[PDB]
Copies of this chain bind each other. A is one copy, B any other.
Amino acid sequence: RKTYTLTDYLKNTYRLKLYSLRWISDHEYLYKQENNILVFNAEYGNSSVFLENSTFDEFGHSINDYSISPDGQFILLEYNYVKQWRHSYTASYDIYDLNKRQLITEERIPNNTQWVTWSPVGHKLAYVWNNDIYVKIEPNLPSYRITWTGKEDIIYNGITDWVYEEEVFSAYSALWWSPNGTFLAYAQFNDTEVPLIEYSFYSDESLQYPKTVRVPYPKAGAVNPTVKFFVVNTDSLSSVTNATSIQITAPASMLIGDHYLCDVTWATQERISLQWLRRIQNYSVMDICDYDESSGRWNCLVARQHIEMSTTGWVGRFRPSEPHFTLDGNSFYKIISNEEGYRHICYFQIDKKDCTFITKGTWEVIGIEALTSDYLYYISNEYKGMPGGRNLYKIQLSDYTKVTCLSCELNPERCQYYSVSFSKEAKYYQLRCSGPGLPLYTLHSSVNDKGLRVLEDNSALDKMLQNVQMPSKKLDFIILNETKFWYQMILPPHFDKSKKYPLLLDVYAGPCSQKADTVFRLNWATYLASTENIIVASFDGRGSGYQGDKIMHAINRRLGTFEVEDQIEAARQFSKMGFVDNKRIAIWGWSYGGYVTSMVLGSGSGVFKCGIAVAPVSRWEYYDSVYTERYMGLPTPEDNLDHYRNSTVMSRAENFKQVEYLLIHGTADDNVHFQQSAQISKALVDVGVDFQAMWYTDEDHGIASSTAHQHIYTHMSHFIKQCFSLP
């Protein structure tokens, strides 16, 4: 008799269980059962105790996170967490002798520390504090300071600046240990001439004057951060004579000006691989560098260089692909765009440049997951030719024709979207199944591909969802101009197609995106279908990923065109299916999806009655260089300025007189600046179109505060119900 309500979504009434584990070796792992930490085994099957909350109760502070040294002699405790950007944050840390569970009382790690990490083996500690790198050889000994040039908002040693964090590395750290822990590679960033985005921060009502936050942030075209790459030998670290870091420079063809470090990957104890991307992101280079023992130097040979370029677009999905190296270091595999657009695994000889593809066909490999001397494990969307499915494939390195799907046939109906987590030498592996059924977590022996045991099956959640009228999920395709274009639909319970349902188009449509897949979700859409009897739909048009460069590069230098068109055509196609109410079709999206929603509302197509845009881009000149330029080029008279000017939502203001528009934006959005939306509202004011608006004081791009998250979704519900005349 009951439905999945807005409160159910906001108060998490029906929770998805996870089996988040972390491998400590090749035989055992950890799990948070209760909130006491337990060790687990797969070998003989048994699983004993290891830690608890009352090991660190009289501690005082609540632990945000922990981390075991590879050797298992030490545990690092993370508390005083203060979030910064999407990945960056600051924190305070304590180390215990995990053997004795007593805190290392002296030579403690400093407060406000910006990143910390163990070496891959032993118990070496590397942390960054005040933008400088430090090393602690034994947790109780004094640190050795590596760099002395760290300066706030200017020089970043071992950590990323704003744009390398969001766009290049998707991480705060710019530190990379060598496999045995002798060398610490790191990057240094210089934002000296990079302009600041400035915005107000209001804080608690106690703050009498608002604070102005100033972040180095290169918008399209602006001066970018420069970069340097170093390696230092963490064994011969003296105490009387400052550490000397050896610099590895970028190849010549990069230094001609404006480039990025986009990959760092070790090969052996004495071999590291770097990838550089020109600022025009259609040309990338990989340099392989050997440590010269009778020198203390790093040499990168010109012959060893390989080149990834693209004549039809940029290189990569969002970046050049990472290389996985065979144990000797003389060979590596990396996913690249194959001869005819599809992304597949190529086999590389270190010395010569002619690689050779080990997979082919009209599907893409998503990621290379594991490497042994025997086989190679990877994930892809081949099974049943479904771009939005994921399965685990194993390929025989001696015979490339002999491939095996390890996850495909396991639970066909329930499970079409897998991810995997291997043990430290790949003798065991966990399978995450994220849908279409209820997520299922299962442990396997890779030695004989036999399934060991069910870790978590969500039978608790399964139990209560029978008391609830839940929405169904349709995944299918439509043929446009002789091409397969995929869509998904969240359909009300008891869906009957002799009725005319109101339809909300849920859009992102960004370059290389996918909103049509086999993943089970419980979200705002679940509530709209379940309670409000609304169909929620998404569609992957030209520009979306995982279906070949043809489709993805289709909007190169041409944001705001074919991905905007195709969303409109998606609606038409859905209405043409005969179970949609033509007078009640809405469109909504967040971030890039905000931009597209707005362009669609500005397009005058007359299909959409109303729409919601949340933190949208309004014109591409306002957004950060790394992301924007990759798709647009430079906004200069001799490159792509014309299109920059042709693709703003401001220019389309007049057309919003045909729709109901809700524009929402957080005032502390470091990513997509309130500016972008301020320019939208001003344009609409200046042509005289009424619209709803909502700012969120001090919320960033996530609008992720508990109370704000609740507030916005409640607000958007009201808007859609009312637009749809729902009672």
Which A residues are within 8 Å of any B CB, using their own CB? 249, 252-253, 255-256, 283, 290, 292, 294-295, 297, 299, 301-303
Contacts and interface: CB of A to CB of B under 8 A. Distances in A.
B292 A256 contact: yes
Contact of A297 (B252, B256, B302, B303): B256
Contacts of A253: 292, 294
Given A249-B303, A252-B290, A253-B294, 11 more contacts: A252-B299, A252-B301, A253-B292, A255-B299, A255-B301, A255-B302, A256-B292, A256-B295, A256-B297, A256-B299, A283-B294
Contacts of A255: 299, 301-302
A294 B302 CA distance: 17
Contacts of A303: 249
A289 to B, nearest CB: 10
Nearest to A252: B301
Nearest to A253: B292
A256 to B, nearest CB: 4
A303 B300 CA distance: 15
Contacts of A297: 256
Contacts of A302: 255
Contacts of A252: 290, 299, 301
A298 to B, nearest CB: 8
Closest 6 CB pairs of A and B: A256-B299, A256-B292, A252-B301, A256-B297, A255-B301, A256-B295
A308 to B, nearest CB: 13
Contacts of A283: 294
Contacts of A295: 256
Nearest to A302: B255
Contacts of A294: 253, 283
14 contacts: A249-B303, A252-B290, A252-B299, A252-B301, A253-B292, A253-B294, A255-B299, A255-B301, A255-B302, A256-B292, A256-B295, A256-B297, A256-B299, A283-B294
Nearest to A304: B252
A311 to B, nearest CB: 12
Contacts of A301: 252, 255
Contacts of A290: 252
Contacts of A256: 292, 295, 297, 299
Nearest to A283: B294
Nearest to A292: B256
Nearest to A254: B299
Nearest to A303: B249
A294 B307 CA distance: 12
Nearest to A280: B295
A286 to B, nearest CB: 16
Most chain B beta-carbon contacts within 10 A, residue among A256, A290, A292, A302: A256
A277 to B, nearest CB: 14
A639 to B, nearest CB: 13
Nearest to A299: B256
Nearest to A256: B299
A292 B301 CA distance: 19
A328 to B, nearest CB: 14
Nearest to A298: B256
A349 to B, nearest CB: 16
Nearest to A293: B253
Contacts of A292: 253, 256
A294 to B, nearest CB: 7
A299 B290 CA distance: 21
Contacts of A249: 303
A228 to B, nearest CB: 13
A294 B285 CA distance: 13
A276 to B, nearest CB: 14
A326 to B, nearest CB: 19
Nearest to A249: B303
